[PDB]
Design a binder for this molecule. Structure first.
Ligand SMILES: [Mg+2]
Ligand SMILES: [Zn+2]
Ligand SMILES: [Zn+2]
Ligand SMILES: [Zn+2]
Lengths: 114, 133, 196, 559, 141, 49, 159, 102, 43, 65, 263, 84
RNA sequence: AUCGAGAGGAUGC
């Protein structure tokens, strides 16, 4: 009766962006991006690849409350290198590993029998 | 910025004190006979056993976010295999002519017993510890 | 709840994803907390579970009858032969993350009963409604969009807190409150209020 | 007694209650549908027309908004019908009865109320789903698990009414309670069984988590702490980061049994400043105990800081454990075969010990202790000989339990459970009692008709030889049944006596209140105490300090 | 044919009953440490034997699996709660017309049964599903 | 599966719950209190079947 | 019975002492005995202690008991509280029980005792006695829907 | 001013035992500045611990005894709730009376 | 249902105890909570 | 009451497999054990969706109009 | 190829048992989740009810019908009903279906999902066919009927995803193991004697190597190799599940990449 | 009668009850567009504003503290210390 | 609406 229609898990509401980006007041060269209508299947990937990048000091995400579909990823990087890039380079680096995955699988699947 | 004590110690007792990833260790000092050491060592990260002999340092040196490595291309006060970083809590006067400092590497502890470290093992927050070979 | 006085409410709902899961791929339907175990000492709960698993596998009835020759041992030796570890543990993988779980977890079939008392049949609220006739107080029960009784025992804790202005409003502004005249002399309510 | 001293009243609500590890201590999950109903009367003022006119427009049906608006004449503009409802120019010194919003004060109680503490102001978080949500550690002083207890909420109507909750009744200000001159809110369940698990010397976090947990804590300075381990791999200790939770200048000392500044059992506790030095964090430290962290952090830093502290510990511990797992199998009541020989050979030498005293009593040698029946000092002799067999066999199974034992581990944290529970579950249940005598003879000179008359031995008078694991027997069952029943019996009427007492207790001191001369009197103005509590001190602030002018040698004194 | 007698509590007062008809009265001539510890045979006059002890119970506890492995007031709770448990309350619910009735979408007979569930027709109008349960201190909700 | 044993009245299923009384026609002796003039009383509830 | 007591040298030590316990009580005469310390002897009847040793000794006895209830279970209630209660009874000169007989028939406004036990009759004989009721007690002001001279209500407020 | 002296007495005995000249200097080596504070502190820290004129201590004390009463349920003496009952009744018909001679 | 058709009232020295002679006749466990606890039995 | 489609816990369709279950038991004379395994029910939540389920529908069907 | 190394051992119409070499664990996971949750599908989601004298109530069947496995092969070209510019539904967003049966005989008349019937234009795409894996050839078991009972229905199946309801999920059980001997000691196994004579050796313990007593802890090592296995309900065949998983994962990663450009 | 400017025992400090009520009493006035005596550096909650008016000792109220006999004492909210 | 009975929920660890 108070229940929140499923679809508010993946559809954005109103006046809401798929990202709000904000500067961490604590450190320098630090940033905490919000991720509306998302979760672990997405946060957890971003971070851990964001940790292969050797020019990143800090990276983490947090589902603040499972009632809602958010998750905040905070990213701190070397002098100069603005984090949006670290996000970028990493974001891509996955697309790639995924692009091969598809194909490499594609190759193997075609070879089996049954 | 520099070293604060050095010696070569002799393992006398290895204690699986109902643990699996930590040992309390009892080492003795080669040279000085008025000295010993009690110490907590991650035996999964650096094995120790009966009748071993390990070099031991201090230093307060080589406080802002501990950056990761990137130190395949940096300075590293380590020819040493095994190295922790804690805080000193009490410095104990037991007779003499003697003295003993206690250390806490986030719970892993250390007791050291002697006298010349009077002007060296300060009671500051910094204090690394390096074991090798 | 279940069947061993181990009654409980749903605190949350998780999707098959975020749930822990076994390496065979099994999610669990519900999770209870291993704290409601040692104090109420219900051990049968633990058994039925173990027995059930064996029964889910062997496709047999679990003989849960009282005084019988049936041991935890007895079940285990069977559950062992059957591909799992003899006391109902299974290595589980957290689901947010994928990383295997540092401790093994107890996991089985276990008859669970949906009881009456759903939240939505209780959830009652009021902000001013109808009054009773005699008192001019609010009406009893939720069934009439009721009023909640600030019970004597409660008032005492408002005296206890020393918050008087709160205690006056909760017993005046809302609940009753009425305007009557009194005689300067004969100190009663004889005064005919010929207002206007 | 039912209409003046206690009135039915408006502006109130009630639902079921459920535990929310991601709520601040002093908060309350109001179901949206309730927040849609309860109403604060707010005044028209330059400060608010904007948030407000907005709400009037927002409608009494989407959330932040209102029913009713009230005017100069003082007539009721009804915002769910009314021709000029998408209109209305708010005109200073008018009133907009808005819905209840986030961060409002509310009095939230639980019956039966036997505390100032069973009535506490909370902040408001409007949420989805129709359960009233609260932070575990606002459990103890309301006394409500989540098995299905309902709870009550009231909403203030004057500005001052607000104040009066948010300055006096507000939860944080209750955290260390008059009653027991110690705190009353603690670290409970999971978090407790976790904040230990986290703390063991063997518990090392590595970077991936370490960073998240850090993030996880909301007040984190953003300055990663240097790791304890830097060698072959950079790791942190459990203690290491939990410490992030703990504020600054928080100092703490313990010493348990074997506690020697090195504590080679991780005994005691040493907390120097924001950090932890050695020893396991558990109940004695983190529960609502006396010398413990909560009692410290409050008097030290504030209610607020401590209040926050709660969240911090949990938000982290929860997280660590969330990823580590924990459980309880039946294998957590099993114990060694070679012990399950000792347990039985410990019962069978107590059973054969009753048998001799029994056989001796029957040969009239049994001497009557001064002042008691010959029978009386057999009845007592035996009960002692049977309780002893249990604790003995019980404890003989506490020694067999490994460290990896879950049940054994909660007890170690003091999360739930105790000794007995082990002894019961794993070794032997015990002697049943009704009006403190081993099972009576309801049948003439026997207990059941499966027994022979004049049988006084343990198997016949309610000794349950077996464990819960092994399984009770017919007789055993029926006995233990007899006993347990007594439990239920009084609780349905031990409480009815209790509840009379309180009402009297309350009705009699009621109006005794310290006056503005610090004397303590009633409505007649008759002293009862010339200074409150013999020292004009309020209980809260007081704690247990050793007066060490008292003990010691005349010698050790002078030195 | 007189193989069974009806006995009341007054007469009960004068008899000697045996629990297990088997083990409790053959000869007296190795021992599974797993089984519980049963007392003895120590009577020689036995008039009557019990039908099955399981039968000291009533309708609601007969729905409890291994009650002989439970702490006692616990058996009572479940006894009180079986009665608020939801299910098929009568086959003919469609036809009958009384204030309030609830039936389970997909009830199930339990995985662990009582020899006594059999005559209570539980396996046949059960109230409750055999849900996969996990005991575990997850998230913390 | 309906097993009966109830009644129907105004259309609602009604059950008689067995009442329980102490039996009539039985001799019992009943030790009595300290500030009572009576040490032992023997009661018989006598009624015709 | 155990006892911790001063050695000369300074320290407290363990001097164990034989002690006699009883069924039933006549203190008026057990203390007058030889061989026994009539400064120290104890009867758990605090009602007897009241008669023999005076109203003030009875205070503590009551307490010591009320206390031995609280902490026999293992609890601990801070002194001030039970102390308050102890005094509360023991000020009207004799022991003034926590029941309609004792506390609830002493002065105090009628409207007040009205809120306890003998509701009507209080009012009755209070109408005939032509009682005056102060209006200084919690209960009194609740009944009339006023701010009760209580914490927040102790003082007036002016400008 | 005499009731004033009396009311502190206990607290002072500590005070003096912990602010003993040998201690202040020998056991926890203070300074002038540090001391002046330690003092200035206690004064205020104390002043906060007084009972506020308002505190409704009647109820307080009741509750404070009532609760742990409710926490009672289950070597022969009248204990637990019934004894409590006997105590508040001013029980002339008491179940376990006992002397305890020394 | 099966239970409500087998219930036992007793109106009003120790009458809520489960008593030796109940073995085999009344159900040792089944019984209602609080209010009139132990008075009511089921067969 | 009509064999569920797809077990709540695994998700695998279990509707289609009621009928077959019956035959494999009561015709070619198997035990429910190996009977659940021929139907491709290896995982036991989905093993328990069928062994437990009680087909009451048969009964409600008995009633006439 | 270059990185993530898939290799099948056993494979079928419903099982793809495959190692997945050289990846982050973090990923492998996200793959499985997105697998179970976010891969769109078709299933019934609106039941218009003409007549139903069944022994089942209306909203039951409606539920039952939801679950029924419908063809989602060409699904990725059917348009979301929220999106498509039409008032309620259309054949550009929905496949409408019909069920009628009627008690004909004495002997209980079944109502299979073979008795389901497409009505709207398929525009020639492969969609909305009630899947049958049944040997006898009657997919699922909607309901039963006695002598004189009708049932008249109108299913409008629409695009959707498991996150919105486990009907739209196209999987079920996803097998998932890594490091079968605890070499990473990610777990701490519970025991009463021999940890290794107490738990079972997982089938996965042949491909990998044993530890050898003498070797110390390998600490710096991380998570490679993930002994997975995907079963399928079969709206989408096995291969497309994994394929489209990878796909949707990548797809929604990418929407962020676009989001960042659009700010 | 009265009680003089001096000759005062009455805890000079602020009883929480006094304070709470004083805050409250301005918190009321404020919320009814009555004049404000501080600079609202950003807050607009009337209670949160009174907390500022206090923290800056500008509240024109006198406590009247009642002694049990019928006398009483005046304290402006300037005079009283506010610890707590 | 009002008076009357009865069943049940929370504390039972
Ligand atoms: Mg509860
Ligand atoms: Zn007049
Ligand atoms: Zn399954
Ligand atoms: Zn369309």
């Amino acid at each position: 009766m108070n229940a929140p229609d499923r679809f508010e898990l993946f559809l954005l509401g109103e006046g809401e962006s798929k990202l709000k980006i904000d500067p961490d007041t604590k450190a320098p060269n630090a940033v905490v991006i919000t991720f509306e209508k998302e979760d672990h299947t997405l946060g957890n990937l971003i971070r851990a690849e964001l940790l292969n990048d050797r020019k990143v000091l800090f990276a983490a995400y947090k589902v603040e409350h499972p009632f809602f579909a958010r998750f905040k990823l905070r990213i701190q990087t070397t002098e100069g290198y603005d984090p949006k890039d670290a996000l970028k380079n990493a974001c891509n680096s996955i697309i790639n590993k995924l692009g091969a995955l598809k194909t490499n699988f594609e190759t193997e699947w075609n070879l089996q029998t049954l | 910025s520099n070293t604060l004590f050095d010696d070569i110690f002799q393992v006398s007792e290895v204690d699986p004190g109902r643990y699996n990833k930590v040992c309390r260790i009892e080492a003795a000092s080669t040279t000085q006979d008025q000295c010993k050491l009690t110490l907590d060592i991650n035996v999964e990260l650096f094995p120790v056993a009966a009748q071993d002999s390990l070099t031991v340092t201090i230093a307060s040196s080589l406080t802002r976010s501990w950056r990761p490595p990137q130190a395949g291309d940096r300075s590293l006060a380590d020819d040493y295999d095994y190295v922790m970083y804690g805080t000193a809590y009490k410095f104990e006067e037991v007779s003499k002519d003697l003295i003993a400092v206690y250390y806490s590497f986030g719970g892993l502890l250390m007791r050291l017993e002697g006298n010349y470290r009077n002007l060296n093992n300060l009671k500051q927050e910094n204090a690394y510890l390096l074991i090798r070979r | 709840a279940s069947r061993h006085g181990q009654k409980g409410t749903i605190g949350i709902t998780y999707r098959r994803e975020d749930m822990p899961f076994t390496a065979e791929g099994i999610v669990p339907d519900l999770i209870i907390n291993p704290h409601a175990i040692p104090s109420r000492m219900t051990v049968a709960h633990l058994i039925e579970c173990l027995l059930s698993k064996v029964a889910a596998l062997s496709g047999n009835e679990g003989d849960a009858s009282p005084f019988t020759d049936i041991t935890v041992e007895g079940i285990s030796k069977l559950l062992r032969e059957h591909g799992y570890q003899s006391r109902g543990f299974e290595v589980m993988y957290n689901g947010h993350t994928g990383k295997k779980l540092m401790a093994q977890i107890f996991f089985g079939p276990t008859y669970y009963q949906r009881l009456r008392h759903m939240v939505d049949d209780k959830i009652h609220a009021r902000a001013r409604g109808p009054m009773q006739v005699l008192t001019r107080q609010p009406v009893e029960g939720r069934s009439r969009d009721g009023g909640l009784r600030f019970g004597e025992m409660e008032r005492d804790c408002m005296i206890a807190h020393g918050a008087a202005s709160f205690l006056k409003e909760r017993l005046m502004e809302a609940s009753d409150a009425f305007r009557v005249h009194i005689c300067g002399i004969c100190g009663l309510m004889t005064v005919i209020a010929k207002l206007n | 007694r039912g209409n003046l001293m206690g009135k039915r009243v408006d502006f109130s609500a009630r639902t079921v209650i459920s535990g929310d590890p991601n709520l601040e201590l002093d908060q309350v999950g109001v179901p949206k549908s309730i927040a849609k109903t309860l109403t604060y009367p707010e005044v028209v003022t330059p400060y608010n027309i904007d948030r407000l006119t907005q709400l009037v427009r927002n409608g009494p049906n989407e959330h932040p908004g209102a029913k009713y608006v009230i005017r100069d004449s003082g007539d009721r503009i009804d915002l769910r019908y009314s021709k000029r409802a998408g209109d209305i120019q708010l005109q200073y010194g008018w009133k907009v009865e808005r819905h209840i919003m986030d961060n409002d004060p509310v009095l939230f109680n639980r019956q039966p109320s036997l505390h100032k503490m069973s009535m506490m102001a909370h902040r408001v978080k409007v949420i989805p789903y129709s359960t009233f949500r609260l932070n575990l550690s606002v459990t103890s002083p309301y006394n409500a698990d989540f098995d299905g207890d309902e709870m009550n909420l009231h909403v203030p109507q004057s500005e001052e009414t607000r104040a009066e909750l948010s300055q006096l009744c507000a939860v944080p200000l209750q955290i260390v309670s008059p009653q027991s001159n110690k705190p009353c809110m603690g670290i409970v369940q999971d978090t407790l069984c976790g904040i230990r698990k986290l703390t063991l010397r063997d518990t090392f976090i590595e970077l991936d988590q370490v960073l998240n947990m850090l993030y996880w804590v909301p007040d984190w300075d953003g300055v990663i702490p240097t790791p304890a381990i830097i060698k072959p791999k950079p790791l942190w200790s459990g203690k290491q980061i939990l410490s992030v939770a703990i504020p600054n200048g928080i100092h703490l000392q313990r010493f348990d049994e074997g506690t020697t500044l090195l504590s080679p059992k991780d005994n005691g506790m040493l907390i120097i400043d924001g950090q932890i030095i050695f020893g396991v964090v558990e109940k004695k430290t983190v529960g609502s105990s006396n010398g413990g962290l909560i009692h410290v952090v409050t008097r030290e830093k504030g209610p607020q800081v401590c209040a926050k502290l709660f969240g911090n510990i949990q938000k982290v511990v929860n997280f660590w454990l969330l990823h580590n797992g924990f459980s309880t199998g039946i294998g957590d009541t099993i114990a060694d075969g070679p012990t399950m020989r000792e347990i039985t050979e410990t019962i069978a030498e107590a059973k054969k010990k009753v048998l001799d005293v029994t056989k001796e009593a029957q040969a009239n040698l049994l001497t009557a202790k001064h002042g008691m029946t010959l029978r009386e000092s057999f009845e007592d002799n035996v009960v002692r000989f049977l309780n002893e067999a249990r604790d003995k066999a019980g404890r003989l199974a506490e020694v067999n339990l490994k460290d990896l034992n879950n049940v054994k581990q909660m007890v170690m944290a003091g999360s739930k459970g105790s000794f007995i529970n082990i002894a019961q579950m794993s070794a032997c249940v015990g002697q049943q009692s009704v009006e403190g005598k081993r099972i009576a003879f309801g049948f003439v000179d026997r207990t059941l008709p499966h027994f022979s008359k004049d049988d006084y031995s343990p198997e016949s008078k309610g000794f349950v030889e077996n464990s819960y694991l092994r399984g009770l027997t017919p007789q055993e069952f029926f006995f233990h049944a007899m006993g347990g029943r007594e439990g239920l019996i009084d609780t349905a009427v031990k409480t009815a006596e209790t509840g009379y007492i309180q009402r009297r207790l309350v009705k009699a001191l009621e109006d005794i209140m310290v006056h503005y001369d610090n004397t303590t009197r009633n409505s007649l103005g008759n002293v009862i105490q010339f200074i409150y509590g013999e020292d004009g001190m309020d209980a809260a602030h007081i704690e247990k300090q050793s007066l060490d002018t008292i003990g010691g040698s005349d010698a050790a004194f002078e030195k | 044919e007189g193989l069974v007698e009806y006995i009341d509590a007054e007469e009960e007062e004068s008899i000697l009953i045996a629990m297990q008809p088997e083990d409790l009265e053959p000869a007296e001539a190795d021992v599974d440490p797993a089984k519980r510890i049963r007392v003895s045979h120590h009577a020689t006059t036995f008039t009557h034997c019990e039908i099955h002890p399981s039968m000291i119970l009533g309708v609601a506890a007969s729905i409890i699996p291994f009650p002989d492995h439970n702490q006692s007031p616990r058996n009572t709770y479940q006894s009180a709660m079986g009665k608020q448990a939801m299910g098929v309350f009568l086959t003919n619910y469609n036809v009958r017309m009384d204030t309030m009735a609830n039936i389970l979408y997909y009830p199930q007979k339990p995985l662990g049964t009582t020899r006594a569930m059999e005559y209570l027709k539980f396996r046949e109008l059960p109230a409750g599903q055999n849900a996969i349960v996990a005991i575990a201190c997850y998230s913390g909700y | 599966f309906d097993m009966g044993g109830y009644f129907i009245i105004n259309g609602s299923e009604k059950v008689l719950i067995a009442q329980e009384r102490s039996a009539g026609n039985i001799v019992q002796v009943f030790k009595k209190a300290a500030p009572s003039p009576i040490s032992h009383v023997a009661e018989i509830r006598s009624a015709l079947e | 019975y155990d006892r911790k007591v001063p050695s000369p040298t300074g320290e407290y030590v363990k001097e164990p002492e034989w002690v006699l316990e009883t069924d039933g009580v006549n203190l008026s005469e057990v203390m007058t005995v030889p061989g026994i310390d009539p400064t120290r002897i104890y009867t758990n009847s605090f009602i007897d202690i009241m008669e023999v040793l005076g109203i003030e000794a009875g205070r503590a006895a009551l307490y010591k008991e009320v206390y031995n209830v609280i902490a026999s279970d293992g609890s601990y209630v801070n002194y001030r509280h039970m102390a308050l209660l102890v005094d509360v009874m023991t000020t009207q000169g004799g022991l003034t029980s926590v029941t309609r007989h004792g506390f609830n028939r002493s002065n105090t406004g009628a409207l007040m005792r009205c809120s306890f036990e003998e509701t009507v009759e209080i009012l009755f004989e209070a109408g005939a006695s032509a009682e005056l009721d102060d209006c200084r007690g919690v209960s009194e002001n609740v009944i009339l829907g006023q701010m009760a001279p209580i914490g927040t209500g102790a003082f007036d407020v002016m400008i | 001013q005499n009731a004033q002296r009396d009311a502190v007495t206990l607290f002072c005995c500590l005070l003096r035992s912990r602010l003993a000249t040998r201690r202040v200097l020998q056991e926890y080596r203070l300074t002038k500045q540090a001391f002046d504070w330690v003092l200035s502190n206690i004064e205020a820290q104390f002043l906060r611990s007084v009972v506020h004129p308002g505190e409704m201590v009647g109820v307080l004390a009741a509750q404070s005894i009532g609760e742990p009463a409710t926490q009672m349920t289950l070597k022969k003496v009248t204990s637990g709730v019934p004894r409590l009952k006997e105590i508040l009744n001013v029980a002339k018909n008491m179940k376990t009376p006992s002397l305890t001679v020394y | 249902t099966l239970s409500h058709l087998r219930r036992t009232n007793t109106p009003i020295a120790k009458p809520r105890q489960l008593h030796n002679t109940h073995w085999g006749l009344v159900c040792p466990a089944e019984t209602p909570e609080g209010q009139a606890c132990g008075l009511v039995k089921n067969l | 009451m009509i064999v569920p489609v797809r077990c709540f816990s695994c998700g695998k369709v279990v509707g289609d497999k009621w009928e077959s279950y019956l035959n494999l038991l009561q015709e070619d004379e198997l035990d429910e054990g190996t009977a659940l395994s021929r139907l491709g029910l290896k995982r036991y939540c989905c093993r328990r969706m069928i062994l437990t389920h009680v087909d009451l529908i048969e009964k409600f069907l008995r009633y006439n109009p | 190829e270059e990185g993530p190394q898939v290799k099948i051992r056993e494979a079928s119409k419903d099982n793809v048992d495959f190692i997945l070499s050289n990846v982050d664990l973090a990923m492998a996971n996200s793959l499985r989740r997105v697998m179970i949750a976010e891969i769109p599908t078709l299933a019934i989601d609106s039941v218009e009810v003409e007549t139903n004298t069944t022994v089942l109530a209306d909203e039951f069947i409606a539920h039952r019908l939801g679950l029924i496995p419908l063809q989602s092969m060409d699904i990725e070209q059917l348009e979301y009903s929220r999106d498509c510019f039409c008032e309620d539904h259309c054949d550009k967003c929905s496949v409408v279906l019909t069920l009628q049966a009627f008690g004909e005989s004495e002997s209980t008349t079944n109502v299979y999902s073979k008795d389901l019937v497409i009505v709207s234009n398929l525009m020639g795409r492969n969609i909305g066919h009630p899947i049958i894996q049944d040997k006898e050839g009657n997919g699922v078991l909607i309901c039963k009927l006695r002598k004189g009972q009708e049932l008249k229905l109108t299913c409008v199946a629409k695009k959707g995803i498991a996150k919105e309801h486990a009907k739209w999920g196209p999987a079920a059980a996803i097998e998932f193991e890594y490091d079968p001997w605890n070499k990473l000691k990610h777990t701490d196994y519970w025991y009463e004697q021999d940890s290794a004579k107490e738990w079972p050796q997982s089938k996965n313990c042949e491909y990998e190597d044993p530890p050898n007593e003498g070797d110390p802890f390998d600490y710096k090592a991380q998570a490679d190799t993930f002994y997975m296995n995907v079963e399928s309900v079969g709206s989408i065949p096995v291969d497309q599940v994994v394929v489209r998983g990878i796909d949707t994962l990548q797809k929604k990663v990418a929407s962020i990449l676009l989001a960042l450009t659009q700010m | 009668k009265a009680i003089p400017k001096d000759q005062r025992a009455t805890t000079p400090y602020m009883t929480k009850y006094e304070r709470a009520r004083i805050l409250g009493t301005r918190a009321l006035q404020i919320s009814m567009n009555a004049p404000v005596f501080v600079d609202l550096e950003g807050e607009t909650d009337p209670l949160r504003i009174a907390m500022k008016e206090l923290a800056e000792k500008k509240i024109p109220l006198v406590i009247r503290r009642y002694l049990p006999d019928g006398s009483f004492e005046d304290w402006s909210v300037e005079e009283l210390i506010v610890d707590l």
